[PDB]
Subunit: 456 residues, 4 copies
């Protein structure tokens, strides 16, 4: 079963916004549902669904700005894009390794946690097989309701408009159903001024070398935050700029270890989504807070220990902490950034993070590892907001990820699904790779179920 | 320097209540301060301080009710009773091993974490060297103020009364200064009824075998809680009663790993007590909460993984969880205990721990691993409460552990020190062994400083 | 593709002796070669090959006498019966877990090394799918050459005779090709007398409980050897007989760790068989000796450390080694066994293992963990020996495992293949599970290649 | 007790050649034997023994040419220079940490294996306390027998002559007793030509940067060998020369893991020296061979795994091994070195290491990590050879390390002791730090016993 491209002017069955892991999992699940080898009823399928994926990136990439050398996956390779739904799938990580002549070699490592670089290539290899149905260099700018009968009051399709990233021309594609799977945006502290020397972690590998071109120069470089991203950048900087002075600034008193214990981590199981979803708003908010240390503002223990050991090595060489080349400043917040000075160094003013004073740093660059927001789907959906039930000022995704729309305004064949931004309703596993294989399988059934039943 | 006993009728310089690790650390620090080999000025000491320790236990023991087989220390052997203050001390763990012909053998293990049994013997070996100045089988029942001039309004000594545990006779001992180092009491949920089949974790090894005498019998045994004590008991029961059905009942959703990461665990450093003490009440309460996972309601990762692996082994044998010999029931609370029935089994009624229904268990015994309180010193000190500054209805320990008393009611030579119950003012390390060597050294200086300066 | 049984009187294409992992891997590879889903050319296959497997065991079991509780696999689950040849196979370990509803649960363990019990069930589950073509309770007793034209001098088939284990009746089955995959036999020291109290490790779980029925009795039990089997039995005995005195007797000075380092362990790679096979007899013998510590007379480090820790715990309780409940006696050999005494205890006489005296032990049982031989195929093949090239007094397997036979005495369609006894020619991976998936694939091509090419 | 210097012209009680760890352990043991705090009888000592140490290095250093960044100790810090003999000693590693204000900080690492840099500083700190009795920049060139009565036939003292390393002047010092503790020499393959580009591992940090001054240059660098030194250099080169192509050449098929298992490693226990020494020459040679993997031609597992992981990362980027930046060439030997060419690169000719052809490498430098010999003491002792028993052409050290000399030629007060070269008679622990504390204690008793008994 090879998915063929649909002409731009034809009515699509599905239009996915984004082609990151979440969308890729849906594409794979669709391939597998139409594979007569994997699914018996697939022989009876006559027509290929008309499908298209829109991705703003020029080609498949997985958080390329954070592909720090030596950087490792944080989940078992078994939770790849296909295995948890079907180990027989040709899209498993193990089958990818086999296709590359690397299976025996990966096995000899005895590791569940491949390099981020390797796992990106696996997903890239997966993504390449859907090149006929993916349009790269397309940034979706809006989703617009359409009525096949304009004189009526019922919406039965959607228009998706995207801007070509190279040339800036706007194209439209019409579809019965939309999936929005666009991940998250860089989250910056509101207090920080805009400056080329102030860069979010997500652009670390991509944009910092352009700013600090000489690797041997004695720069002063600061890192803000204490999550995984901060730890990785802080650690890497010591290798990438050997003569640099680095400072880690955090409002917490310490880097804290991620919770990887097996009982707690069962919250990430695919079957647990039903259980999480069915809870009340108060119980869900309570559960997410209670299990926060699995995912947010936490560092893998092994990395913490490495950094800590480097700190002690500095202590051996020099007992005076103020003289260390690489330093951690706990329980601090940035009150002022001076960035209009003649010199190439900004002046960062610090105070105690403690509730109701401190030093100053001269830095060539500030890396801001302050996490992400997942609200970008809102802007894409503003023109379809009036289709929601009257008075409801927020999108409400059902268990199957389809947003609630007023039944009398929107036809049953038309719909919009959200992926990767539903943590509040679906649990901590929603933004991760943990349930993507199973969720992909669910999504295909939700969207293409009518066609798949006919063949079944 | 061998500490000789003081006659019961003589005025003591110091009377310590309790002879657990905290008091033992003080005894060792005193020995070391008078040791001319360790402290040069010690030659000039002419008089041995008149000192006595009162312990209710018949002999030195360290949480004997929880000496579960295979049970391990949770801190490095380096934080023993002497090393952090002076590695040259004859009371180090390494010197103990040397004295037992076991030093090379411990070394070959490559472990920082000795069995609790071994560390108890080390402390027992330490304790034995002070047998002249320790009175076992003495439970202190009250501390009473005394005035060397009864017609005056100034208190300058204390009377300590203790009841002989075997024979019940009351003895009095007079002292200028008192240390109260009595650890904690068993904490029981208020809702649970009194019953011989309901036993606190602290009495697990000591009292459960008396209740369930036949090791091969198919008992039903429940464990309440999800901290270290619960995990250890739950795990051990499977070895101790091979044919038993065990249930772990917890209000939390999972066992959670203790935080042993190196940056966070620096809060346990001796030098950090100054920093913690100097903070405000709000900041201290905030800090203790933030670092709770280092010590409370947490299980060492390795034990969690073991228990989890045992659970998966049960899954391999039987896919139906309700049929498992050993089970965990998360997010539950006990609403009712039926314990007046004719049969030897109580009936435990369960409900969801979730805020505003569930099963019933028939159990031969309920092990209650619900932690400890440290308020027992209050009852001992009721008759000295009037010596506090007017209106102050709680004991306030200074940095050096001496409680605040009204300067015009209490002479400068008389005082009371608290040890092991000061977490609120001194930090998380207060109840542990972490700072005992250093704290012991501090205590000796605070209490015997005037004499030690004369020789200095 | 479901393999149907062949009537006993029909000429088979293949007859496999044994249905252990090696034969099971061949069955799976055949299933996969005929699976049109996995192999495209398989559609064109018209006729199912006539195949049969003969197994002496009543049902599939994997070293059941050594299924010690808690006993673990020593290779990655990835080297299962199918994955290294094809990750898409329905016979992978991961697909088995999926079929049992256990995939997510195994994943949460983060282990490459499943319990031996679990891996046995996986293989059992695999084996069950071939029940139509496997005859259990059949012990093959001889292989006899046949000539379709008896007046000629050319052998073109083989007769395989097996004795029914329950009823003892002899059945014959004729085949063009034979595979002998019968594993190894218990290896006993020649010096030891025959006695019910002297039991090889391979019968430990199965036969020792019949001899020592009371688990609480204070037996004396000895273990001879220092390989993995000895370590496991010695360790287990302490749990299985809590009041017993156990002795480990070894001629070496210590238990030695298995080599699991990644560069050395590449010898176990499937591609390395070509390289090993092509070497001279002297170079192969040299290589096997050099890499012996990967597999023979070695104990997994983690088990050594456990046992060692138990020994140190005994030291803590009692400093006098001669009084320990569980002891290791290094550098000893057994010179005499007294087993005609009135009492239930044999008397074992010991001497120094050192080249050119010692204690005596009274034991209820001696467990002999002295490894295996793989020469049992010789007895099965005695009547076909005359078919070898003149003067050649040993079976010579080619790279593809087919033994050399005189071309003028044996027709090209007839042949005999050896599996699991070819370490001398094919390398250390030959007796293990390491190359079974790939070897199975090779074997199917070697044996059924002509038919598979026609469809190709 | 502070050891004061002896005038050069006075008869010494002891003259030690070398001031590495072995000699330092003797100095510490002497300090401790005279310390009235540690040894009670020490008060009665009236006279300080006249002692001197001669060291060719300008100051204390511990294998400075191999202080590779991140390089770690391979034995527990507990086997330092004093602890195994006396934990109360002021020369323990833990007391050193305390003296540096680093004790709490080392403890928080939870490691038994300090950096080689840290352990060097510890020993340096130890060494500094004996600066009065150590002469640096003195290379001992010969040991000469002396007779206090020249007309007699009895030798009763020794003359030790050393050359000043800076100025080259020869000085003589007379002593009753000599200790030779000079470690080992660089061992080079006889086949390799002399060349500045061919450097032994022992001079890696010291001399390679002088040869290859530009760290960013694309050099080709080869490493010969497969022991710990080779692995460390090979690994380090990748960090030190990021753009370089490195090749590891080894005659073995793989890097092999050091044996660190606890039962085997008991051979390193101090008490085991008696047992080893008492064995025959054949049994000792047999034992050393059997336990070789503890110490020789082996790499710590963790380093092997790191290097292996780096190799697999190269495989991910490029599947063609011949194109890798860093390569391992197993089972090779160097047959020819071309080093008279005009270019700065030598041409290394390789062949199979296999017993009775291969590539060529162009390299800027060859690092030769081929281990050490310990025969340098022979040259120092040639002029005293005639004092041995007639016909005996090798030095025979007793259990107490004193060489056998003819009783009628050498007076009982005069003697020579060997340290660090006695592996053949005393075991594998002889060249290591494992028994230095205890051996130091033994040596002091052997040499100064008569004086120490008088005070006892
Ligand atoms: C550095 C890093 C490492 C991580 N490692 C792990 C890990 O090891 N394991 C794990 O489980 N999780 C990990 N995560 C969590 C992460 O959320 C998931 O791995 C994954 O990226 C989520 O997939 P997604 O498709 O929802 O979002 P994304 O991966 O962000 O993909 C969304 C795609 O949509 C595209 N897009 C966005 N806007 C538009 C638009 N307007 N028009 C068209 N296209 C658009 C983007 O270019 C992007 O390619 C990591 C996250 C980061 C930042
Ligand atoms: C099972 C268990 C394991 C632990 N393991 C560790 C560990 O590995 N590391 C660590 O740092 N901490 C550990 N702890 C924390 C523990 O608080 C300390 O190790 C230590 O016991 C504290 O010493 P203490 O002297 O303050 O209190 P205690 O140890 O309780 O000693 C107080 C003594 O006072 C006696 N006493 C009480 N009342 C009276 C009275 N009225 N009259 C006379 N005598 C009296 C008691 O008998 C007792 O002996 C553990 C605690 C438990 C329960
Ligand atoms: C306790 C133990 C644990 C092991 N664990 C591992 C591991 O974790 N990983 C690993 O790679 N290797 C392991 N091995 C090595 C082992 O050799 C292989 O796992 C595997 O058993 C080899 O398969 P086989 O089919 O060649 O031989 P076997 O497993 O012995 O199977 C041969 C079969 O032939 C049958 N048979 C014998 N004679 C006759 C006859 N005359 N007629 C009919 N049938 C007959 C036998 O009943 C048996 O079922 C282990 C071995 C042992 C003993
Ligand atoms: C890189 C490296 C790391 C090691 N790490 C460890 C480890 O972690 N643990 C361990 O147990 N062992 C280790 N070893 C083994 C090592 O042998 C010991 O640690 C230790 O160096 C032995 O001490 P020594 O005094 O016998 O010899 P050395 O350390 O070699 O000291 C002998 C001294 O004599 C001096 N000398 C030599 N000739 C003369 C002369 N003619 N005149 C005057 N002075 C002279 C030398 O300068 C030297 O300082 C290591 C060895 C190496 C090379």
């Amino acid at each position: 079963p090879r998915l063929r491209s649909t002409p731009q002017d034809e009515l699509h069955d599905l239009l996915c916004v984004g082609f990151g892991p979440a969308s890729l999992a849906i594409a794979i699940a669709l391939h597998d549902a139409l594979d007569p080898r994997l699914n018996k009823s697939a022989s009876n399928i006559h027509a290929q669904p008309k499908i298209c994926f829109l991705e703003r990136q020029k080609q498949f990439a997985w958080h390329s700005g954070m592909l720090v050398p030596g950087s490792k996956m944080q989940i078992s390779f078994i939770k790849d894009l296909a295995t948890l739904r079907d180990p027989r799938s040709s899209f498993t990580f193990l089958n990818y390794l086999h296709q590359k002549g690397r299976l025996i070699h990966f096995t000899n490592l005895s590791t569940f946690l491949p390099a981020r670089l390797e796992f990106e290539d696996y997903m890239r290899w997966c993504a390449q097989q859907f090149s006929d149905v993916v349009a790269y260099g397309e940034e979706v700018v809006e989703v617009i309701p359409g009525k096949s009968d304009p004189s009526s009051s019922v919406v039965d399709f959607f228009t998706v408009r995207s801007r070509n990233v190279e040339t800036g021309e706007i194209s439209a594609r019409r579809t019965r159903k939309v999936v929005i799977a666009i991940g998250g945006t860089a989250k910056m502290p509101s207090g920080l001024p805009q400056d080329p020397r102030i860069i979010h972690s997500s652009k670390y590998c991509t944009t910092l070398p352009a700013l600090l071109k000489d690797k041997s120069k004695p720069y002063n470089i600061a890192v803000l935050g204490s999550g995984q991203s901060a730890a990785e950048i802080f650690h890497d900087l010591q290798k990438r700029y050997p003569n640099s002075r680095t400072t880690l600034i955090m409002r917490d008193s310490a880097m804290r270890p991620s919770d990887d214990s097996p009982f707690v981590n069962e919250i990430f199981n695919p079957e647990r989504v039903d259980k999480f979803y069915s809870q009340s708003a108060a119980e869900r908010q309570r559960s997410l807070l209670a299990d926060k240390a699995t995912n947010y503002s936490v560092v893998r223990l092994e990395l913490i220990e490495e950094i800590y050991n480097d700190m002690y090595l500095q202590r051996v060489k020099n007992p005076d902490e103020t003289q260390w080349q690489h330093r951690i400043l706990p329980e601090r917040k940035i009150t002022r950034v001076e960035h209009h000075g003649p010199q190439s160094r900004m002046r960062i003013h610090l105070k105690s993070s403690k509730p109701e004073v401190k030093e100053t740093l001269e830095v060539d660059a500030l890396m801001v590892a302050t996490g992400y927001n997942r609200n970008a789907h809102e802007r894409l959906l503003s023109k379809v907001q009036h289709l929601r039930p009257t008075g409801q000022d927020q999108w409400k995704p059902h268990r199957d990820y389809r947003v609630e729309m007023d039944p009398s305004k929107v036809s049953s064949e038309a719909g919009i699904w959200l992926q990767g931004c539903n943590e509040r309703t679906h649990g901590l596993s929603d933004s991760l790779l943990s349930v993507l294989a199973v969720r992909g399988g669910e999504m295909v059934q939700s969207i293409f179920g009518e066609q798949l039943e006919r063949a079944a």
